[PDB]
Amino acid sequence: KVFEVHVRPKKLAVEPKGSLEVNCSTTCNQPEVGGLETSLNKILLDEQAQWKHYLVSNISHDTVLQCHFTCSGKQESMNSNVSVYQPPRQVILTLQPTLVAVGKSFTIECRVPTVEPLDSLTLFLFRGNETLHYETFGKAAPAPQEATATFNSTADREDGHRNFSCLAVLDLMSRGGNIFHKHSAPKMLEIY
Amino acid sequence: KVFEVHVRPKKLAVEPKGSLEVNCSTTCNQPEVGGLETSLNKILLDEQAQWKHYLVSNISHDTVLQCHFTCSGKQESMNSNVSVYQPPRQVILTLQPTLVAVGKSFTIECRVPTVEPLDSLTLFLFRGNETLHYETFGKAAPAPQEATATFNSTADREDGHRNFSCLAVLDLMSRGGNIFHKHSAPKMLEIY
Numbered sequence: 070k071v072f073e074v075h076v077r078p079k080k081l082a083v084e085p086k087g088s089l090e091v092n093c094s095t096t097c098n099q100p101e102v103g104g105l106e107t108s109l110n111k112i113l114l115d116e117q118a119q120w121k122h123y124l125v126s127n128i129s130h131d132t133v134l135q136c137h138f139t140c141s142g143k144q145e146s147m148n149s150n151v152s153v154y155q156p157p158r159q160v161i162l163t164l165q166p167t168l169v170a171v172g173k174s175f176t177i178e179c180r181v182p183t184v185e186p187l188d189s190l191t192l193f194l195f196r197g198n199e200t201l202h203y204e205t206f207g208k209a210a211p212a213p214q215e216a217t218a219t220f221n222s223t224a225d226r227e228d229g230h231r232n233f234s235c236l237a238v239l240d241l242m243s244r245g246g247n248i249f250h251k252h253s254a255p256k257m258l259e260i261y
Numbered sequence: 262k263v264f265e266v267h268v269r270p271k272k273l274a275v276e277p278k279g280s281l282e283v284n285c286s287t288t289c290n291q292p293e294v295g296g297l298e299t300s301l302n303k304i305l306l307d308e309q310a311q312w313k314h315y316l317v318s319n320i321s322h323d324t325v326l327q328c329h330f331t332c333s334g335k336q337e338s339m340n341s342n343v344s345v346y347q348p349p350r351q352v353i354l355t356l357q358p359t360l361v362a363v364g365k366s367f368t369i370e371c372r373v374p375t376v377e378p379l380d381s382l383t384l385f386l387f388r389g390n391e392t393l394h395y396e397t398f399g400k401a402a403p404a405p406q407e408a409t410a411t412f413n414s415t416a417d418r419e420d421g422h423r424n425f426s427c428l429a430v431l432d433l434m435s436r437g438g439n440i441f442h443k444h445s446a447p448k449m450l451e452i453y
């Protein structure tokens with residue numbers, strides 16, 4: 070007979086050394102077998118015939134939790150995707166050269182050390198209040214765990230009075246986590 | 262190739278809700294498989310290629326821990342016997358009747374509520390400083406968890422001035438535990 074097995078939470082992001090509670094349940098009344106399989110340490114906190122609640126702990130990297138139940142010789146299962154993350158904590162802006170001749174080129178560069186996963190980190194390069202460029206990571210250019218975005222522009226007369234800045238956004242929403250923002254201190258360019 | 266697997270401690274007695282650390286080791290250099298199997302909650306505290314140290318917890322009744330390692334497709338293993346215990350905490354002595362005619366019979370009775378395992382509990386019936394009787398439990402007469410020892414004697418003139426008492430001894434030495442003693446308050450008989 071067709072039965073279901075569910076895991077709450079289906080996905081969740083947690084920081085290094087973090088932990089989480091998982092409720093592994095099924096529609097089967099008397100499961101012959103039932104459990105949450107994981108490579109991490111786990112404590113069955115509580116169970117009933119139709120569910121088991123565990124506390125899984127000390128998560129260091131992405132990992133999958135396998136929740137399963139056997140009903141009349143038939144096994145069903147469902148996984149929970151746990152992701153690790155460290156939010157942008159420092160965002161540095163650099164203008165190269167700091168002194169530029171009007172109408173000539175310069176390089177804006179943004180760097181965010183220690184942030185993961187990087188394939189969910191996007192950096193924005195602003196000028197005053199206009200977005201000049203932005204890029205998501207995760208293809209290799211400083212990828213799983215350390216990123217940088219550099220853009221070239223030409224110095225304009227108005228850059229004598231508008232700030233350049235960068236914004237890091239770690240969107241963990243599709244990984245069961247939230248959205249983290251960190252702005253850099255603004256930097257003005259010296260033009261002549 | 263012949264290898265060994267050892268568990269420390271080979272046996273241990275612990276109280277209800279207690280816990281213990283187990284060091285599961287082998288002589289095999291690179292075990293393909295290795296672990297401590299148990300029905301209790303367990304935390305791998307630390308490991309090396311030749312050992313795993315776990316903290317097993319919340320022990321409620323006797324239980325066996327299965328320590329195993331696989332070396333080149335061959336499995337070896339060794340168990341650790343965990344016993345639960347609650348030491349004698351109260352020992353009551355009763356003389357029936359309290360007033361006895363010299364040369365006539367009376368019943369000494371000792372009772373120790375809540376003590377386990379009972380097959381390692383021995384009660385002693387003393388008169389002054391002489392052991393009158395003693396019995397080990399574990400055959401059914403109030404057995405796994407609640408015991409009583411009753412003995413009959415004839416009232417003697419000297420019982421007018423010597424105390425009757427009982428001593429409970431829980432010897433857990435063959436179960437990896439220690440030895441617990443609890444005496445009862447002394448009771449004198451009234452003879453006429």
Ligand SMILES: *[C@@H]1O[C@H](CO)[C@@H](O[C@@H]2O[C@H](CO)[C@@H](O)[C@H](O)[C@H]2NC(C)=O)[C@H](O)[C@H]1NC(C)=O
Nearest residue numbers: 078079080081132133148149150151243244245
């Ligand atoms: C957990 O992670 C796995 C790994 O990607 C996800 O599996 C994919 O799920 C989609 C949607 O059903 C399929 O199209 C893919 O083929 C699956 N890939 C694999 C390797 O199985 C799964 O969906 C994730 N679940 C959640 C809730 O995040």
Ligand SMILES: *[C@@H]1O[C@H](CO)[C@@H](O[C@@H]2O[C@H](CO)[C@@H](O)[C@H](O)[C@H]2NC(C)=O)[C@H](O)[C@H]1NC(C)=O
Nearest residue numbers: 077092093094095096115116117119120121122
């Ligand atoms: C774990 O999840 C299960 C499955 O959804 C929960 O079970 C339900 O719990 C509520 C309250 O106990 C009941 O109204 C439902 O009917 C229960 N369903 C079943 C099949 O028993 C359970 O409460 C959760 N447990 C914990 C500790 O979070």
Ligand SMILES: *[C@@H]1O[C@H](CO)[C@@H](O[C@@H]2O[C@H](CO)[C@@H](O)[C@H](O)[C@H]2NC(C)=O)[C@H](O)[C@H]1NC(C)=O
Nearest residue numbers: 085086087110126127128129304305306307308
């Ligand atoms: C959480 O996980 C980490 C990584 O597995 C554990 O760190 C190891 O700890 C041992 C023993 O304390 C050290 O000898 C290792 O060098 C550590 N490895 C790494 C990669 O850091 C940490 O101990 C775990 N925490 C708990 C409470 O089990």
Ligand SMILES: *[C@@H]1O[C@H](CO)[C@@H](O[C@@H]2O[C@H](CO)[C@@H](O)[C@H](O)[C@H]2NC(C)=O)[C@H](O)[C@H]1NC(C)=O
Nearest residue numbers: 194195196197198199200201202227230231232
């Ligand atoms: C950045 O701020 C400037 C204002 O200092 C914005 O300029 C606007 O220009 C548009 C079109 O010329 C007008 O609709 C607004 O009235 C102006 N705003 C102000 C405050 O003067 C500019 O649009 C803003 N850019 C972005 C991307 O928001």
Ligand SMILES: *[C@@H]1O[C@H](CO)[C@@H](O[C@@H]2O[C@H](CO)[C@@H](O)[C@H](O)[C@H]2NC(C)=O)[C@H](O)[C@H]1NC(C)=O
Nearest residue numbers: 165166174175176177202218219220221222223
């Ligand atoms: C921004 O300008 C810099 C500096 O002129 C460019 O860097 C040069 O790139 C070429 C092609 O990759 C290299 O061969 C040169 O050695 C680089 N110059 C120096 C001085 O190192 C860079 O390509 C530009 N980037 C963008 C995004 O416009």
Ligand SMILES: *[C@@H]1O[C@H](CO)[C@@H](O[C@@H]2O[C@H](CO)[C@@H](O)[C@H](O)[C@H]2NC(C)=O)[C@H](O)[C@H]1NC(C)=O
Nearest residue numbers: 196197198229230231232233234254255256257
């Ligand atoms: C460029 O950035 C600087 C640095 O934040 C801005 O200067 C601040 O401006 C406010 C409003 O006038 C003052 O109360 C602060 O004390 C200033 N801080 C410093 C360090 O000077 C400046 O407003 C920005 N310029 C533009 C054009 O947006």
Ligand SMILES: *[C@@H]1O[C@H](CO)[C@@H](O[C@@H]2O[C@H](CO)[C@@H](O)[C@H](O)[C@H]2NC(C)=O)[C@H](O)[C@H]1NC(C)=O
Nearest residue numbers: 270271272273324325340341342343435436437
């Ligand atoms: C753990 O408990 C088991 C259960 O009795 C003990 O197993 C017996 O061990 C003796 C000595 O080798 C054998 O003669 C018996 O046949 C075994 N019985 C069974 C059912 O296997 C074991 O010795 C105990 N170990 C310790 C250290 O207490």
Ligand SMILES: *[C@@H]1O[C@H](CO)[C@@H](O[C@@H]2O[C@H](CO)[C@@H](O)[C@H](O)[C@H]2NC(C)=O)[C@H](O)[C@H]1NC(C)=O
Nearest residue numbers: 269284285286287288307308309311312313314
């Ligand atoms: C667990 O038991 C093992 C096996 O006896 C211990 O390993 C020995 O530890 C000492 C010090 O580390 C060494 O001198 C021995 O040579 C080790 N033997 C091997 C095979 O490595 C281990 O120390 C114990 N671990 C804990 C945490 O108690």
Ligand SMILES: *[C@@H]1O[C@H](CO)[C@@H](O[C@@H]2O[C@H](CO)[C@@H](O)[C@H](O)[C@H]2NC(C)=O)[C@H](O)[C@H]1NC(C)=O
Nearest residue numbers: 112113114115116277278279302318319320321
């Ligand atoms: C230690 O083991 C006991 C016995 O398995 C656990 O007691 C159960 O606890 C649940 C949830 O707290 C209660 O709903 C049950 O009625 C209890 N059963 C019995 C027989 O007492 C106790 O929770 C365990 N402790 C830990 C920390 O897991």
Ligand SMILES: *[C@@H]1O[C@H](CO)[C@@H](O[C@@H]2O[C@H](CO)[C@@H](O)[C@H](O)[C@H]2NC(C)=O)[C@H](O)[C@H]1NC(C)=O
Nearest residue numbers: 386387388389390391392393394419422423424
């Ligand atoms: C109990 O105590 C009495 C002493 O009050 C013991 O009587 C002893 O009797 C033996 C043999 O007649 C003598 O060797 C001792 O000198 C006596 N002891 C004393 C203190 O007078 C009696 O032996 C003791 N019984 C036990 C079992 O120890």
Ligand SMILES: *[C@@H]1O[C@H](CO)[C@@H](O[C@@H]2O[C@H](CO)[C@@H](O)[C@H](O)[C@H]2NC(C)=O)[C@H](O)[C@H]1NC(C)=O
Nearest residue numbers: 357358366367368369394410411412413414415
């Ligand atoms: C101690 O004396 C008591 C009381 O006389 C004995 O109890 C009797 O035992 C018989 C045989 O089992 C029963 O049929 C009677 O009903 C009991 N008498 C009463 C009043 O209940 C007891 O057997 C003696 N025990 C010992 C160890 O000497």
Ligand SMILES: *[C@@H]1O[C@H](CO)[C@@H](O[C@@H]2O[C@H](CO)[C@@H](O)[C@H](O)[C@H]2NC(C)=O)[C@H](O)[C@H]1NC(C)=O
Nearest residue numbers: 388389390421422423424425426446447448449
């Ligand atoms: C019988 O038991 C009683 C109760 O312990 C003993 O009485 C004690 O004796 C000592 C020594 O003389 C006194 O310091 C205590 O205060 C007494 N307690 C009580 C409640 O009276 C008595 O010594 C024992 N009798 C025999 C013959 O051993």
